[PDB]
């Protein structure tokens, strides 16, 4: 007794391998019930009409249209297999105004389709809300991560400023912007590497450059080794990475809030 399970808006229908109806349980004509029943069935939860049908039939093997239903029904003690686009399910759809009438879901065609139309409007409105709810659940997370990154930038960059100041304390008040400061440490290390030509790569004009070069020449800081700079550069590069990560999240946030 191999049965093919058809689960439609109209209800739960049992078919044999030649496309004959063995037994059926019709859905109630309730928009809310059918809508929410279709939603769980996308995840692979059987219709409550299916559960009743598989009781008063109880076949040797049931074949199903959705492979997420397989393990759910194998918890109820059925032998369950999956056939993607079976002849029998096609045979069900070929007959589909008519059988809605035959199993008494609709009194005629006009009202089957009137109900089908009411249904599809509810079902997609439901899925709209929930797609909108998920989308902006994801967007607040992106927003809050940006806050987390902001806070972190201030933290690490205040650490870098204190740490690097042992070598070149003068620079801290000369570079307001955390990204510019991190860039100088990351790029040039030693205050002794700073040249006119390299500071232009950051777009500073004559006054800023000559102030910074002056500070490095007359600097009060200590000499440092390549291992010392190296460790400081781990913080400096992390700050740069986070500015980068912040910008990419803002692109994500726009495209999605859009």
């Amino acid at each position: 007794v191999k049965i093919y399970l058809i689960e439609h808006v109209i209800g739960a229908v049992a078919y044999d391998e030649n496309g004959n109806i063995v037994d059926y349980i019709t859905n109630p004509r309730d928009l809310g019930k059918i809508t929410e029943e279709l939603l769980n069935n996308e995840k692979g939860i059987p219709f409550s009409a299916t559960v009743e049908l598989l009781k008063k039939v109880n076949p040797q093997e049931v074949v199903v249209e959705n492979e997420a239903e397989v393990p759910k029904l194998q918890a109820l003690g059925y032998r369950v297999s999956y056939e993607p686009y079976s002849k029998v399910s096609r045979i069900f759809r070929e007959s589909l105004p008519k059988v809605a009438i035959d199993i008494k879901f609709a009194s005629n065609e006009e009202d089957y389709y009137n109900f089908l139309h009411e249904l599809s409007l509810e079902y997609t409105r439901r899925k709209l809300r929930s797609a909108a709810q998920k989308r902006d659940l994801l967007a607040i997370q992106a927003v809050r991560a940006m806050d987390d990154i902001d806070k972190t930038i201030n933290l690490f960059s205040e650490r870098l400023r204190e740490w690097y100041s042992i070598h070149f304390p003068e620079l801290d008040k000369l570079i307001e912007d955390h990204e510019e400061y991190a860039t100088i440490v990351s790029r040039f290390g030693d205050r002794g590497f700073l040249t006119i030509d390299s500071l232009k790569e950051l777009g500073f004009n004559e006054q800023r450059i000559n102030r910074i070069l002056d500070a490095a020449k007359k600097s009060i800081g200590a000499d440092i080794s390549e291992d010392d700079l190296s460790a400081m550069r781990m913080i400096a590069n992390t700050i740069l990475d986070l500015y980068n990560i912040r910008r990419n999240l803002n692109n994500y946030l726009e495209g999605v809030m859009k």
């Binding site: 993607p84 686009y85 070929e94 389709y113 997609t124 409105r125 797609a131």
Partner: protein
């Protein structure tokens, strides 16, 4: 001004004061606009202009689609329904006894497809991914015609997967794909269908659409 029956059922042509021709469908919902398109009144009947620059299907007609499988009473599965520009016209052609099932993935776009379908009892809109026909299988029905217009690298097999679920044997499919030969040009997709389908026509959509072509096929 004048309106004329074409070769194809429920598809008409306007003749204009300026000397130009425009495609045209009979309005299933009188007085109500859809997407800014013009309403024209000839001999008591209201027609909606069908802009070939916005709609791929109108494009194909003027580029010489020989036979159009979308006629009165046609059941269609439309993948890529978008905001409703072109299904609104199939809904005109289809008339009330035909049915158009419209599948669309994008929330923003779908929101506008609701407005169209609310006023049109033969349009059944669905937010769903066309990659998973099992997620609207519980709602649709078998169809005479599979219309497919997605911007996906793998449109063809997606179309094929849908066909084996929904398309009646000897039904037809219109697929929207990305000079001196005939259809060597499109052998990759031409062949992939042939493993189970039957090409009838491939139409270049220039200068109406300069990115896409259309394949009319027959499911064996």
């Amino acid at each position: 001004i004048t309106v004329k029956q074409t070769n194809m059922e429920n598809i008409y042509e306007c003749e204009f004061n300026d000397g130009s021709f425009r495609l045209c469908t009979r309005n299933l919902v009188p007085n109500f606009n859809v997407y800014g398109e013009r309403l024209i009144k000839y001999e008591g009947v209201e027609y909606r202009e069908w802009n070939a620059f916005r709609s791929k299907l109108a494009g194909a007609i003027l580029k010489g689609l020989k036979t159009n499988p979308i006629r009165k009473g046609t059941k269609v599965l439309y993948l890529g329904a978008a905001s409703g520009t072109t299904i609104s016209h199939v809904s005109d052609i289809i008339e009330l006894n035909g049915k158009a099932y419209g599948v669309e993935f994008s929330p923003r776009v779908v929101r506008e497809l609701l407005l169209v379908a609310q006023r049109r009892p033969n349009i059944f809109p669905l937010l769903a991914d066309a990659r998973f026909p099992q997620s609207y299988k519980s709602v649709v029905e078998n169809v005479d015609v599979l219309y497919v217009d997605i911007a996906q690298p793998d449109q063809t097999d997606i179309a094929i997967y849908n066909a084996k679920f929904f398309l009646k044997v000897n039904g037809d499919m219109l697929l929207v794909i990305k000079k001196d030969p005939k259809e060597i040009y499109k052998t990759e997709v031409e062949k992939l269908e042939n493993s189970n389908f039957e090409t009838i026509q491939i139409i270049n959509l220039d200068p109406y659409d300069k990115d896409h072509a259309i394949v009319l096929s027959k499911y064996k």
